Amino acid sequence: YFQGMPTINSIQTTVNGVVKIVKPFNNDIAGEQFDPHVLQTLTAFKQPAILENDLAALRSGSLTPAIADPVGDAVTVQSRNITALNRTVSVEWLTPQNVINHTVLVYFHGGAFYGGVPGNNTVLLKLVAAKSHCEILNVDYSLAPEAPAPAGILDGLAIFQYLEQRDAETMITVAGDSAGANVIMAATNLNQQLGSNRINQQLLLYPVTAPNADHAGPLWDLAAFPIIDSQRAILTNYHDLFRQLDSIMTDYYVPENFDSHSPLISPLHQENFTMTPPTTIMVGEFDPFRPQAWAYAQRLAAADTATTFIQYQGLNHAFAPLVDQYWQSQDVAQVMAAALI
Template sequence: MTIHPEIGKILATLPAPPPGPLNPAAMRAGEAAQVALPADRLPLHAVEEATVVTPHGEVPVRIYTPVEADAYGLLVYFHGGAFFLGSLDTHDHVARALAKESGHKVISVGYRLAPEHAFPAGLDDCYAVVRWAAEQGESLGWDGKNLAIAGDSSGGTFAAAVAAKAHDDGFEKITHQILFYPSLDLDFDVDRYASLRENAEGYGLETAGLAPFNSFYLDSGADPADPLVSPIKRGDLTGLPPALVITAEHDPLRDEGELYGQRLKEAGVDARISRYSGANHGFVQNFSWIPDFYRPFHEVAGFLNARAAK
């Protein structure tokens, strides 16, 4: 299937990237300028700012309560942005939709970014907030059932790495992992996956841009051979939480996400792979206003709530 026509129209208007090295400060400012005004955001019962004190320092979080209820499942969310972009604000609409459709209380994590913070700062923050959520379950109104993690793109990297790290630490309270078009192999050899060539140009995220966009993270000490950096390199996937892996047809990262989902299945993990036709990388963040591409939020809700009912 060709790219969705609405996405195609927008891709056709994108300017060529400026010459020279990437400028994190300028790119973050550009993202911030696109954030919706508070009055235009999806209304929920409550949205609260909080600070989580961890062994590594203070981590800002935003807590989304969908409706008034006695108790909730918890979903800890890690935003994308190639480890140096993204914020609580740029992905606020994703967290709101996850809360609304799933009925879970969502905790979005404002983890430390590269290049200002070296590996594993961001990963440490994400993992620490998950542990905090379990420890503070009573004050968060946790129903004691679902404690899910989710992330998009590089946030999906963190979600997969947190799931593995928790398993290795004997922390078995994570019940689900949800990976939206995850970046799972930071070895960007174009011959590793067919989608790196098939979707190399013209779909927003381009294969040639993967190395420079991820260079801030890799240059901070993240080794692509480390399974906590490239989760697909983990040899043993047994015992990891049930997974929903959502991929996009026109995404260079499509095949590594689907291979990871298949490897989870082969390891005995209850894993579901869901490819969205006509979609590109980032579609959940950028194009959820297209009805077909809002559907992942309903899919997540079904995945979480069906398992919670067992």
């Protein structure tokens, strides 16, 4: 499934205990500009964006039309309901040929806590299942504001309990992208505080680790994103849109009795990272959430948890499911499958 891919010279270093892998978008450009395939999608950001705080309008921009599917029949995709903790959760269940025992992956889609659908990343996960021969749960977890924090977190815990009671030898890898990664990270933390040790790995695609962090702070500073002149207005406008989204989405996700800076809403602000599973983070050079993902990686490493931080040069937010658009998305699938076997 991974042919026609470029031979990229990646750069691997160790920074504060973090294994860092920087992958340029080609071998002639090391950084500081968008991958050209990304750039052609960002034409709108030549002008500033004003994000209207309207739920339906926001949701209406969170459906990805079908991605070309090279896997086809080689992986079965079927929906079913599971029930634990008096919560019924719909999951899109992926089964490959010759499925392997015990190892299972649980995935939460992104969509800024309030939107998206699991179908947004089906094809990416078919690639992962087909390569690793691992079964995958693509979870239709609760969305805010109708079911704000901690509903999605509790759905995750329900899923983990179901899997562990189903099979005592199960090894669970948790994964997600964006706000979905945030929710499953919190569920994982909670699973561990109840004494389960079955989750042995996190695979996080551009996670939101600190929702609604200070937008005049170091996590939201555009000076951390050097870029060529011709693309600096586009980058500024793009980053500013995500700054707007960060506030709007957190308001939806967090009810009034709760707070966004708490450990279960901002995994970056956990008091302790010693229980956290070995983690791989994958993120674009120009992802507005990259600094907080890096800060998270450094906290894990300092707690002596093995952490790999793969930075895709020239990439923005939300690229990974787009396997028919970017080689980097195909690489994300490869990296995930290798982590499961």
